[PDB]
Amino acid sequence: MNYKKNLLLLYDRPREPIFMGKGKSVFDVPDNYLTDRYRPIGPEIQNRFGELAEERIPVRSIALPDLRIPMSLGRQEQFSLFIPRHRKIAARLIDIFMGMRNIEELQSCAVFARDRINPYLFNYALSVALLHRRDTKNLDLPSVVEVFPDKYVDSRVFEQIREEATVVPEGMRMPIVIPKDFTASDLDEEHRLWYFREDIGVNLHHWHWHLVYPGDGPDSVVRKDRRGELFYYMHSQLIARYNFERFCNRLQRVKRLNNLREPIAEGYFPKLDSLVASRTWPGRVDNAVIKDLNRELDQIKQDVSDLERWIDRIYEAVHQGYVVDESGNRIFLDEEKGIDILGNIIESSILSPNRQLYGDMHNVGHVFLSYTHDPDHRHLESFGVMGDVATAMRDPVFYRWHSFIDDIFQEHKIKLPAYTKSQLTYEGISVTGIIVQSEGAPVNTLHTYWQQSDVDLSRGMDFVPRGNVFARFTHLQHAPFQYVIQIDNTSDAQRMGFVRIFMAPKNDERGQPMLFRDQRLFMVEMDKFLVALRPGANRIRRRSNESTVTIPFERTFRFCGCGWPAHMLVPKGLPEGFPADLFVMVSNYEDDRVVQDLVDAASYCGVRDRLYPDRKAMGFPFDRLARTGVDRLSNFVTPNMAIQSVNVIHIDKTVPRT
Amino acid sequence: MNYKKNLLLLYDRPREPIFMGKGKSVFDVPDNYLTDRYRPIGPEIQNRFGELAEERIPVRSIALPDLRIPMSLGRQEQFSLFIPRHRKIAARLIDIFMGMRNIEELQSCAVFARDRINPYLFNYALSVALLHRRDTKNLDLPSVVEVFPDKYVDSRVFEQIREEATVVPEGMRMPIVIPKDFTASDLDEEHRLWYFREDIGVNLHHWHWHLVYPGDGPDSVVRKDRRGELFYYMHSQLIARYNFERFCNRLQRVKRLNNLREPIAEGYFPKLDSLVASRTWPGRVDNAVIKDLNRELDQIKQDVSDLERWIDRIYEAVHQGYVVDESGNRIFLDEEKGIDILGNIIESSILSPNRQLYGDMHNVGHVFLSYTHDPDHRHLESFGVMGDVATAMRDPVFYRWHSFIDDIFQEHKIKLPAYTKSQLTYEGISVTGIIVQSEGAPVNTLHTYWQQSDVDLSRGMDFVPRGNVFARFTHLQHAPFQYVIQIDNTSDAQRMGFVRIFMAPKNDERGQPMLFRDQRLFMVEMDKFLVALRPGANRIRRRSNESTVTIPFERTFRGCGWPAHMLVPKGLPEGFPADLFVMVSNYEDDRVVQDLVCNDAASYCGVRDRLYPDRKAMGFPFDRLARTGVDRLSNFVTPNMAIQSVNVIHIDKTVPRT
Ligand SMILES: [Cu+2]
Ligand SMILES: [Cu+2]
Ligand SMILES: [Cu+2]
Ligand SMILES: [Cu+2]
Structure with missing residues (x-):
């Protein structure tokens, strides 16, 4: 509809008042909808822009809900989905946008609010609403990159764009190359993971997760099947993928934060400038120490001890094997629901059975690490990147904080009974082998390289002359490839299976093969998909671009929604080649299937699907300790599994997007 | 001439290329004078600008000097006069700009050079050139604030302006209020001196000083009479004025940094962002450590030891009573020249007799203090505010560092013989009285308050739509006043005398009458001028806005000197007690042999005048220890001196400037 299309205009040029031209349209804003600054000159000011557009969009003045709480955050402040106050403020706004009777009253409300609410907040809330409302599926x-490039882009380019757009005529403007590996030099060994930590797709992924699984909000948008287990598994796969990258950069597996009271060795300076706050992001010096927090405006009063205490209470619950809700009853951490409950406890969503007792450990850790430079607001400074979902993953200490949290999860995991031979076996199914073929490349060889892709940023360049503004981004990529899987059925009937593909490094940091206790943690999911297997032999062909784990290229670089960005499907590897163990398992779909009756089956949208369609623990079968007598992958396998050695070659060459 | 006026058009919109409109004029640029990016679209550029303009300027293409050293600092990098490499670059550029034969040929060089050189450095280098060429006197x-507002105002206003200019047509635009006391909350007691530390006038002062008494450059520009002594005196009076303000905000006299190993207690976060560099001046956390520097791009590899060595060397010379030449000769630090030699050693200007030995103590300390967050440049960050003349006075640690330096100069000062009673009395001359009169106020009362002043930031808002853009600044101000002085002559002959007026607090921090050993260092110079005294009684009236210490109010807000609105200390609302002192010294001894362009013309400009017009030590008569048996100002005074209690009142109210 036109109405639907018009809401998308609210994303165009966030800080340009709504009465200015958006695309080919203008909003006819009512007098009482103008902000205090503009209302007194309103009729003079609305006309200047209002004689440019093709279209004209009428807005009816109506009675609106109370926006005082959403309006409590300043327009030139930063927005943090980790700070409790702000989550409350966001929760409220999502409530309001969700509860508009229809799309016309949403338009009207959003048009009133936009120029009165912090743009990042507005953008978060609206987006969450629009993804979850019935009438706006x-x-x-638009990607938040095109709307707020300032959270993705070296600050240096904004004046470069401003000059280009002012001096050069539209037909003649050349694209701006976005600096890469720009946040530190060779003296920081950590700089090497620029291609991961600072990837547009990786960071977009983190944001998207938080849009679909918000921790506070109307029940409608919060309660999703096994959202606590997803919190666990999503953060887990990041670590594993991150370690994978570390092994391809001559580095060790990421160390957890041992202790909240020891210095944090990895400084990080983001080089981002928030045009919205009109203030640069603070950085964090090498060897900084977390400090007790007292920020009145933020409403955080929290000693390091409070955090340490929550940690101890959780560990106690995991070791007890149960948690205690507010009524005092015990909820057992069983083998279905334990991970889920525990996920809710640690993130601290509203689905925490007892926030008061277990705390808000994960979020508040983010705040602590983001504010080491101004913990009582005496210097009137905002938070560093760790304080924002959008940018947290750029900072190396993210991986260390989350590695630490992952230990709490691992400690629950290693208490569950190992999978038995029986539980891992599909009878009569056997997987004789699996291989990968790239175009032109040797068998069992994956290739990576650099690629430059463009993004139009015009939509986010407030107060810049109209015109395309193409920005060229350098990012990892792989050559396309497929899997070839030999399976024998031998049952005399058709058998349905779930094909599970993971990949892990072959060796540890020292060149020695990995034991299962360790390797199982390093396994990154590459595919999961359903297959009918006919009696006798089956040769199964699977292209890398069908991965249920990833989203298409275009979903990062121009409605179907997010998963892992495709250009990051494959670890970098090494020029000389990096050995990895590729793994597959075919499990019995009859046991895995969710009833999911209907009057892929592996591709899951949280917005769309009521139930996550796999009854197995996320990360099956690597989520538990091996059964007794197993010590490595080669003796872990059952006949319905198979292993393959794979070489990951990287060529330090660029290509122009094809 | 018209060429003079065209040179000034180069300060307009520093980052906008010179082929775009400047003022109501345009330059016609030889095609080969365009930069690489714009030569190809040269034709589509000449048409796109300037046809709106009235004057058009022909630029003669000429042969130009080797320009690579100035070009070696990048257009989007920061510029510092403390960094030795950057100081050398500016010297070369200055050399070029002063080596052009014509004012016409200078226009051509500058026109060519502008769009190719770092804007900060260009403004600096050209400015020094113009101040010193005999043909551009x-x-x-134009004020640096107007061209580079980004060194002077909270970065939060930049988008406020950009919106106001983009949205509202120029007839209807309102002024942007510049926030005051914006760098820190009352949780930090230092915040109370926002009106001093973050005052634009004061910062402009620091900057203008370094333009007239640059420490590297052509000999013609650097070698000014007693500039080493100025350096001591100028920095000594800043501490004095600072201390006065401290005594009016319930603080103590500033404390030296004890040394370079102890953490610096007082952090500072300036809220400035450079639009030239698209980087910030990073804050400094509380309790930060001075760290050894290895900044390769800046060409600085210096250990804290290296600085401590310089300091120990300088202390050793002061106590010795001589420094040692590069050839091994001794130069004595005597009563006349000692302070001057020492000032050149400590600053380390070119004039230092042995820079290998005594180092570059003052400049390098600044750089050290500005780099604690990134001393080896692994995080690719620029220097804090202390690393920039423009901005250094903003940071509390400026006063701590300069107090540490002052202790070294003081160590020389206390070695000199007390001034004798003979040396102080002017035989026949006797001052019986001094009073201050303001309008509408009781005798012996000064008055301060707040004022708002507008400034046009339009010449400094690159890539923002043209038109007036007014910033409203809030700043201290005093009510005008006059000294009335009664002098009895007693000779039958006319007598010439220097009138030297100082002012100090009556009481120490604890409300106890101050004693000379302390008071003398707290004396703030208020005026110095020559008078002719007829035989018998003379009544001298001297208005505040005549002070030789200051420069007109017109020159701050639309010939080095202190800004007129900061002549008088804040004082207190209940009344703050001070001692006003005046001495009439004998001009026949104070007279300087030189005769240049009515002796009563006391306006001294360092570039204009070859020699400093007073043979006395700067700060006389307070620069030495008291002669035996003087303990307090009451016992110090000779007949040709006089003392008056004065009450300094602050009213917390705001006036629009009359
Ligand atoms: Cu997350
Ligand atoms: Cu997190
Ligand atoms: Cu200075
Ligand atoms: Cu200094």
Whole structure:
């Protein structure tokens, strides 16, 4: 509809008042909808822009809900989905946008609010609403990169764009190359993971997760099947993928934060400038120490001890094997629901059975690490990147904080009974082998390289002359490839299986093969998909671009929604080649299947699907300790599994997007 | 001439290329004078600008000097006069700009050079050039604030302006209020001196000083009479004025940094962002450590030891009573020249007799203090505010560092013989009285308050739509006043005398009458001028706005000197007690042999005048220890001196400037 299309205009040029031209349209804003600054000159000011557009969009003045709480955050402040106050403020706004009777009253409300609410907040809230409302499904939202490039882009380029757009005529403007590996030099060994930590797709992924599984909000948008287990598994796969990258950069597996009271060795300076706050992001010096927090405006008063205490209470619950809700009853951490409950406890969503007792450990850790430079607000400074979902993953200490949290999860995991031979076996199914073929390349060889892709940023360049503004981004990529899987059925009937593909490094940091206790943690999911297997032999062909784990290229670089960005499907590897163990398992779909009756089956959207369609623990079968007598992958396998050695070659060459 | 006026058009919109409109004029640029990016679209550029303009300027293409050293600092990098490499670059550029034969040929060089050189460095280098060429004398250079507002105002206003200019047509635009006391909350007691430390006038002062008494450059520009002594005196009076303000905000006299190993207690976060560099001046956390520097791009590899060695060397010379030449000769630090030699050693100007031995103590300390967050440049960050003349006075640690330096100069000062009673009395001359009169106020009362002043930031808002853009600044101000002085002559002959007026607090921090050993260092110079005294009684009236210490209010807000609105200390609302002192010294001894362009013309400009017009030590008569048996100002005074209690009142109210 036109109405749907019009909401998308609210994303165009966030800080330009709503009465200015958006695309080919203008909003006819009512007098009482103008902000205090503009209302007194309103009729003069609305006309200047209002004689440019093709279209004209009428807005009816109506009675609106109370926006005082959403309006409590300043327009030139930063927005943090980790700071409790702000989550409350966001929760409220999502409530309001969700509860508009229909799309016309949403338009009207959003048009009133936009120029009165912090743009990042507005953008978060609206997006969450639009993804979850009945009347606004479809509706391809613009990427937050095109809307706020300042959270993705070296600050240096904004004046470069401003000059280009002012001096050069539209037909003649050349694209701006976005600096890469720009946040530190060779003296920081950590700089090497620029291609991961600072990837647009990796960071977009983190944001998207938080849009679909918000921790506070109307029940409608919060309660999703096994959202606590997803919190666990999503953060887990990041670590594993991150370690994978570390092994390809002559580095060790990421160390957890041992202790909240020891210095944090990895400084990080983001080089980002928030045009919205009109203030640069603070950085964090090498060897900084977390400090007790007292920020009145933020409403955080929290000693390091409070955090340490929550940690101890959780460990106690995991070791007890149960948690205690507010009524005092015990909820057992069983083998279905334990991970889920525990996920809710640690993130601290509203689905925490007892926030008061277990705390808000994960979020508040983010705040602590983001504010080491101004913990009582005496210097009137905002938080560093760790304080924002959008940018947290750029900072190396993210991986260390989350590695630490992952230990709490691992400690629950290693208490569950190992999978038995019986539980891992599909009878009569056997997987004789699996291989990968790239185009032109040797068998069992994956290739990586650099690629430059463009993004139009015009939508986010407030107060810049109209015109395309193409920005060229350098990012990892792989050559396309397929899997070839030999399976024998031998049952005399058709057998349905779930094909599970993971990949892990072959060796440890020292060149020695990995034991299962360790390797199982390093296994990164590459595919999961359903297959009918006919009696006798089956040769199964699977292209890398069908991965249920990833989203298409275009979903990062121009409605179907997010998963892992495709250009990051494959670890970098090494020029000389990096050995990895590729793994597959075919499990019995009859046991894995969720009833999911209907009057892929592996591709899951949280917005769309009521139940996650796999009854197995996320990360099956690597989520538990091996059964007795197993010590490595080669003796872990059952006949319905198979292993393959794979070489990951990287060529330090660029290609122009094809 | 018209060429003079065209040179000033180069200060307009520093980052906008010179082929775009400047003022109501345009330059016609030889095609080969365009930069690489714009030569190809040269034709589509000449048409796109300037046809709106009235004057058009022909630029003669000429042969130009080797320009690679100035070019070696990048257009989007920061510029510092403390960094030795950057100081050398500016010297070369200055050399070029002063080596052009014509004012016409200078226009051509500058026109060519502008879009190719770092804007900060260009403004600096050209500005020094213009102030010193014999053919560009008496030029009203535009204020740095107007051209580079980004060194002077909270970065939060930049988008406020950009919105106001983009949205509202120029007839209807309102002024942007510049926030005051914006760098820190009342949780930090230092915040109370926002009106001093973050005052634009004061910062402009620091900057203008370094333009007239640059420490590297051509000999013609650097070698000024007693500039080493100025350096001591100028920095000594800043501490004095600072201390006065401290005594009016319930603080103590500033404390030296004890040394370079102890953490610096007082952090500072300036909220400035450079639009030239698209980087910040990083804050400094509380309790930060001075760290050894290895900044390769800046060409600085210096250990804290290296600085401590310099300091120990300088202390050793002061106590010795001589420094040692590069050839091994001794130069004695005597009563006349000692302070001057020492000032050149400590600053380390070119004039230092042995820079290998005594080092570059002052400049390098600044750089050290500005780099604690990134001393080896692994995080690719620029220097804090202390690393920039423009901005250094903003940071509390400026006063701590300069107090540490002052202790070294003081160590020389206390070695000199007390001034004798003979040396102080002017035989026949006797001052019986001094009073201060303001309008509408009781005798012996000064008055301060707050004022708002507008400034046009339009010449400094690159890539923002043209038109007036007014910033409203809030700043201290005093009510005008006059000294009335009664002098009895007693000779039958006319007598000439220097009138030297100082002011100090009556009481120490604890409300106890101050004693000379302390008071003398707290004396703030208020005026110095020559008078002719007829035989018998003379009544001298001297208005505040005549002070030789200051420069007109017009020159701050639309010939080095202190800004007129900061002549008088804040004082207190209940009344703050001070001692006003005046001495009439004998001009026949104070007279300087030189005769240049009515002796009563006391306006001294360092570039204009070859020699400093007073043979006495700067700060006389307070620069030495008291003669035996003087303990307090009451016992110090000779007949040709006089003392008056004065009450300094602050009213917390705001006036629009009359
Ligand atoms: Cu997350
Ligand atoms: Cu997190
Ligand atoms: Cu200075
Ligand atoms: Cu200094």
